[PDB]
């Protein structure tokens, strides 16, 4: 799953943690297993 | 105390069950003894442990 989010949400995408877009569009599982990666794509959209 | 033995059998069984049921109240280290509260005031990930 690939999307772009802001820097202050990187700590919101975590197993068992609540947020908004991972709660209002698609949601992560409590038993999730995998990994997440983050790129600072500031010069893409600003 | 002529009937000590039979009386003793009865008492042992009664006491065993009593302690078994009473031990449900112990917390064993958990934050509470009733499961409902455990599952109420805590998120599922921590309620597991």
Swiss-Prot record, chain B:
- Which portions of this protein are annotated as coiled-coil regions? 7-49
The organism's superkingdom is given as Viruses
* Job description of the protein: Subunit of the fusion protein that is processed upon entry into the host cell. Mediates fusion of the virion and cellular membranes by functioning as a class I viral fusion protein. Contains a viral fusion peptide that is unmasked after S2 cleavage. This cleavage can occur at the cell membrane by host TMPRSS2 or during endocytosis by host CSTL. In either case, this triggers an extensive and irreversible conformational change that leads to fusion of the viral envelope with the cellular cytoplasmic membrane, releasing viral genomic RNA into the host cell cytoplasm.
Protein name in UniProt? Spike protein S2'
Q: Which gene does this sequence derive from?
A: S
Tell which residues of the whole protein are contained here.
943 to 991 of 1273
């Amino acid at each position: 799953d690939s999307f772009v989010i802001r820097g202050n949400e990187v700590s919101q995408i975590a197993p068992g943690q609540t947020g908004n877009i991972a709660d209002y569009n698609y949601k992560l599982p409590d038993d999730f297993t995998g990994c997440v990666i983050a790129w600072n794509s500031n010069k893409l959209d600003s | 105390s002529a009937l000590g033995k039979l009386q003793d059998v009865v008492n042992h069984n009664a006491q065993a069950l009593n302690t078994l049921v009473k031990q449900l109240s112990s917390k064993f280290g958990a934050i509470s003894s009733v499961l409902n509260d455990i599952l109420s005031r805590l998120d599922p990930p921590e309620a597991e442990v």
